Design a protein around this ligand. Structure first.
Ligand SMILES: Nc1ncnc2c1ncn2[C@H]1C[C@H](O)[C@@H](COP(=O)(O)OP(=O)(O)OP(=O)(O)O)O1
Length: 284
């Protein structure tokens, strides 16, 4: 029966009473589940792994041994402080708040303060929060401001202090509450707007780019993927390759190139002829 064909599909996942012995019931159709397999229970230990990654900083290597450190839960780690760095220390301490998307109300808010801070700093800067909020969206998960200055480019490749100047600052103001890393061309960290009678902290990463590699790197973080995936294409279609870093005329056999200069966003869109496909509509 259709009836006996189903418990069937359930076992494999997991003469008549002979191929049988070759246990079962309506017990398969019913479901044991995770418990039924309890292999599956060891499989859920894979729920350790990915859950464990959920914690900040910890990447492939990290959790695996950590969990391996007999460990697997919120609280394992909570005890297991010693077992990680300043990074991951945080993305635990916060992590929870970490799984709660912001409100573009606040965005604009920091959106302000950020660019508001820089502006206090110098005029030659230019910053821009990008990623999602840009696209219009009601909900991000990480701030992401992109900076640059004329006194800097892909040629100098040496000006940490620059990017450094503002990080210091955003902290000054008590905004950037903590800090994951730091390494000249990149900052990633934890902010938080201001009070008076408290909001959760949000992941930000300040980047910087030569005032040249700027733009391309710009289009790229506004994504999406697919979006930046549908585009790499067409340009290539029309024979052009692009990357996080830049626009390049192709080649005879694939390998070939050279960076065209790049004033604004729309200049590339010019390159592979397409319409200035505004952010909002930048989904695919
Ligand atoms: N820790 C992470 N590891 C890998 N990919 C991540 C991680 N966090 C986010 N992503 C990727 C996959 C998510 O679907 C996407 C969204 O990240 P998020 O920081 O939230 O950006 P975003 O919220 O503005 O967009 P969305 O979340 O929609 O994808 O980014």
């Amino acid at each position: 029966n259709g009836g006996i064909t189903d418990m069937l599909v359930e076992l494999a996942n997991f003469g008549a009473e002979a191929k049988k012995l070759p246990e079962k019931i309506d017990e398969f159709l019913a479901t044991g589940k995770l418990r039924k397999l309890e292999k599956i229970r060891r499989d859920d230990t894979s729920s350790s792994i990915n859950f464990l990654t959920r914690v900040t900083g910890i990447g492939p290597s990290a959790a695996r041994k950590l969990v391996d450190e007999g460990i697997k839960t919120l609280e394992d780690l909570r005890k297991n402080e010693d077992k990680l760095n300043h990074h991951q220390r945080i993305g635990l301490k916060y992590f929870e708040d970490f799984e709660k998307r912001i409100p573009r109300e606040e965005m604009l808010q920091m959106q302000d303060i950020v660019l508001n801070e820089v502006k206090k700093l110098d005029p030659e800067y230019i910053a821009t929060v990008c990623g999602s909020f840009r696209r219009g969206a009601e909900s991000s998960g990480d701030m992401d401001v992109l900076l640059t200055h004329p006194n800097f480019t892909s040629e100098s490749s040496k000006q940490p202090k620059l990017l450094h100047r503002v990080v210091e600052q955003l902290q000054k103001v008590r905004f950037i509450t903590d800090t994951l890393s730091k390494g000249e061309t990149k900052f990633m960290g934890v902010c938080q707007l201001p009070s008076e009678n408290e909001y959760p902290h949000r992941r930000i990463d300040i980047r910087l780019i030569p005032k040249d590699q700027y733009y391309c790197g710009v289009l790229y973080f506004t994504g999406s993927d697919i979006f930046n995936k549908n585009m790499r294409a067409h340009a290539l279609e029309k024979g052009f390759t692009i990357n996080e870093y830049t626009i390049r005329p192709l080649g005879v056999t694939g390998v070939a190139g050279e960076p065209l200069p790049v004033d604004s966003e729309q200049d590339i869109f010019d390159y592979i002829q397409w319409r200035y496909r505004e952010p909002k509509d930048r989904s695919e």
